[PDB]
Design a protein around this ligand. Structure first.
Ligand SMILES: CCN(CC)c1ccc(C(=O)NN)cc1
Length: 330
């Protein structure tokens, strides 16, 4: 089997991407944030605290003939930005892009934090990291990908995110028309539950490439590129008037700037992030100070290849017995 679904930016900045997902019988379609940095499929629902729902589409298990309470199971998660959610759990039929998993754990939110409430376009999360990070207790549950894997033509999914445009998530096959050149694969550590890999270095603009190992995670659920302070300083030093602002919470630059590209290494291959991908717009409405798309990871504890980096490539999440990550230009 295979599945193929379009993913669409939620706003003009590509703050996140949503993908339609069918849950239950008759289908209930919710737009979920596919997140390769976590491992819970959770949704806004008929159980969510009413004051915490603001425009989201909700899952109503009582309207699904295939929903079953997973008795006694609860879940609770918090993310690196400090957002969080929790609730109870149902099993139900879930389909993505034509691909169906029966018996999928669907985590029903009873509580969500303000950041989720405020994002009216995101109806929940679909985790695609390793199932060892799933938060359901007392019986840990499998991700959609883990459950689907034995049915797939190939034990892979691919992320092809667009810049200010729709993209695609594919399950079970690699679309050879979606990229240019060849795919370079690189080793993955699953020790922390993430798609954790080691970049071979970087370059700023047309500058020479610096060979240096940078361990990080491939995270579709994180907007920006978070890298060591040394690397990030080297980047922003090439932008007149850029500075790190403690009041804003990171590097800012003059909105009149043209940004240099940023290259990261994948083995002997190179992925180039165009400068415009690194512009996240005014820090506040009408401001002439713009927020940078490359930020320091210092104090996060991990480097994060978020959407800013991933959207510059065609990315293969290879869930074979020895998992690997592939990157191609596109
Ligand atoms: C509103 C809060 N949202 C929705 C954009 C989040 C989505 C994904 C993550 C995350 O850490 N993913 N790995 C964190 C927050």
């Amino acid at each position: 089997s295979t599945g193929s679904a379009t993913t669409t930016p939620i706003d003009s900045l590509d703050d996140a991407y949503i993908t339609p997902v069918q849950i239950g019988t008759p289908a209930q379609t919710l737009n979920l944030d596919f997140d390769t940095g976590s491992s819970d499929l959770w949704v806004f629902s008929s159980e969510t605290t009413a004051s915490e729902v603001d425009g989201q589409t909700i899952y109503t298990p009582s309207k699904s003939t295939t929903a079953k309470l997973l008795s006694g199971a609860t879940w609770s998660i918090s993310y690196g930005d400090g957002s969080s959610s929790s609730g109870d759990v149902y099993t139900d039929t879930v389909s993505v892009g034509g691909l169906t998993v029966t018996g999928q754990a669907v985590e029903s939110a009873k509580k969500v934090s303000s950041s989720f409430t405020e994002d009216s376009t995101i109806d929940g999360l679909l985790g695609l990291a390793f199932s060892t990070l799933n938060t359901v207790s007392p019986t840990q549950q499998k991700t959609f990908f883990d459950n689907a894997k034995a049915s797939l033509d190939s034990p892979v999914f691919t992320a092809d995110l667009g810049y200010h445009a729709p993209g695609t998530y594919n399950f079970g096959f690699i679309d050879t028309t979606a990229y240019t050149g060849s795919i370079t694969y690189t080793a993955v550590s699953t020790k922390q539950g993430f798609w954790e890999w080691t970049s071979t270095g970087y370059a700023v603009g047309s500058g020479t490439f610096k060979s240096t190992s940078i361990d990080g995670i491939a995270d579709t659920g994180t907007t920006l590129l978070y890298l060591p302070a040394t690397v990030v300083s080297a980047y922003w030093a090439q932008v007149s008037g850029a500075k790190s602002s403690s009041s804003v919470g990171g590097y800012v630059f003059p909105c009149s700037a043209t940004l240099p590209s940023f290259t990261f290494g994948v083995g002997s291959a190179r992925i180039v992030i165009p400068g415009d991908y690194i512009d996240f717009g005014p820090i506040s409405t009408g401001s002439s100070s713009c927020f940078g798309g490359i930020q320091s990871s210092a104090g996060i504890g991990i480097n994060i290849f978020g959407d800013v980096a991933l959207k510059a490539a065609f990315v293969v999440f290879n869930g074979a017995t020895t998992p690997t990550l592939g990157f191609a230009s596109k």
